[PDB]
Amino acid sequence: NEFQHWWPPLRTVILHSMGSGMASDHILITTYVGLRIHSDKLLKVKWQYAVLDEGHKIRNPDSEISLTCKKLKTHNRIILSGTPIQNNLTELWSLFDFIFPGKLGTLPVFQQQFVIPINIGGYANATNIQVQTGYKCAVALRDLISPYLLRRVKADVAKDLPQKKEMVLFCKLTKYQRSKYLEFLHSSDLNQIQNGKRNVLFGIDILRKICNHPDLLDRDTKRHNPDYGDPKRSGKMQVVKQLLLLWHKQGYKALLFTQSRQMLDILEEFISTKDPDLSHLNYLRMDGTTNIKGRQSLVDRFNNESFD
Amino acid sequence: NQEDSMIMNQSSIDRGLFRSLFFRSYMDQEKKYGMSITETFEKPQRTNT
Questions:
Q1: Distance in angstroms (rounded) separating the CA atoms of residues A203 and A106
Q2: Strands A76-79 and A49-52
Q3: Where do runs of H (alpha helix) occur along chain A?
Q4: Do A219 and B35 touch (CB under 8 A)?
């Protein structure tokens, strides 16, 4: 749309269900999954000006998308990452390697050296091993990369951004929840990690399920569905009810962010039927299985919703 | 009783000679798993198992 609006003469095309393309003359747009699918000559075209939109999708060096993009080497490769580093500096290494392979060291040099934590000398001032004085080394790398990155803060031109609130609420674990938590903690240690596998790495999932939906802590929820969920087993549900009722009486359009869709459905059932107080509030639903057209329709409804 | 076998009076067996009791104890316990599952004693139903 932007291509045909600002610059009609440009020959741009969609590599989703197109044809001709390389057979004809200039610009090509594709999907990352489409790029994976077209591992044919397409990778050998040597697109003079290569630009990737969702750089955040190639953060992982081992991800197939990032490596597939990497094989397509061109004299000018660019990334338009939606966000900078979020998880690890190896992501920045991968991005820079895609755009600037020879200007930065290999994976080892980076990890053993170019790592803000103790690897680079998080105590570079010979202070406590804690990473508090790790400067003049990571700062040097930041200054080296600055001549290769651009960033405009919304406040730079978009000062019209009302106040944000980092209001971290706090809840209390119920006696039932506390008992189950302690039981799991005592019984968690089988190999003490069992390579995670529902003990530490995904025992975190068990802990989260206890915290949120102890009432329906099972895959076979249908057996308990007639009598559960029960908010009495989770004070977080009580806090949610209080806030939702307050915002409904205050007429505020509220957004609720949830974990795996099981919790989503449990909350939906709670609000809809379990508590008549919340049943009075009209609500909307969304999930990862929602249709794209339905997703857009629901977004439009929310932007101008009569719901709560 | 030609080889190491022998002959036994039947009427002695009928009066309690060498009779013995035999006891055999069977064990079974509900399985450890209590994390959303279990294994409970009951009378299984032909239509529900």
A1: 35
A2: parallel
A3: 2-6, 32-37, 64-71, 89-99, 107-108, 138-145, 154-157, 175-188, 203-212, 235-249, 261-269, 276-279, 292-303
A4: no
The number of CA neighbours under 13 Å toward the Cβ of A237 is: 28
Chain B residues with CB-CB distance to A214 below 8 A:
none
Per-residue buried b or exposed e for A194-224, using 16+ beta carbons within 10 Å of the residue's own CB: eeeeebbeebeebbebbbbbbbbbeeebeee
Active site residue B14: no
Technique used to solve these coordinates: cryo-EM
Residues in CB range of A225: below 8 A, 6 or more apart: A216, A269
**How wide is the angle at C-alpha A103 spanned by C-alphas A98 and A109, nearest 5°?**
90
CA atoms lying within 13 Å on the CB side of residue A280? 10
Resolution of this entry, Å: 3.1
Given a contact cutoff of 8 angstroms between Cβ atoms, the answer to whether A22 and A36 are in contact is no
Measured between CA atoms, the residue of chain B closest to residue A220 is: B36
- Residue B6, chain A, CB below 8 Å: the answer is no
Cβ-based contacts of A217 with chain B (< 8 Å) = 36
Backbone angles phi, psi at A256, to 5 degrees: -115, 125
Distance CA A307, CA A282 (A): 5
Picking from A110, A89, A95, A32, the residue whose alpha carbon sits closest to that of residue A64 is A32
| Cβ pair B8, B14 in contact under 8 A | no
Tell if the CB–CB gap between B36 and A184 is shorter than 8 Å: no
Of the listed B1, B2, B3, B4, which one is catalytic? B4
* B36 near A CB under 8 A: yes
Residues 6+ apart with CB under 8 A from A60: A66, A91, A94
Residue A229: cis peptide before it, omega within 30 degrees of 0 = yes
Which residue in chain A has the smallest CA separation from B32? A187
B40 touches chain A (CB under 8 A): no
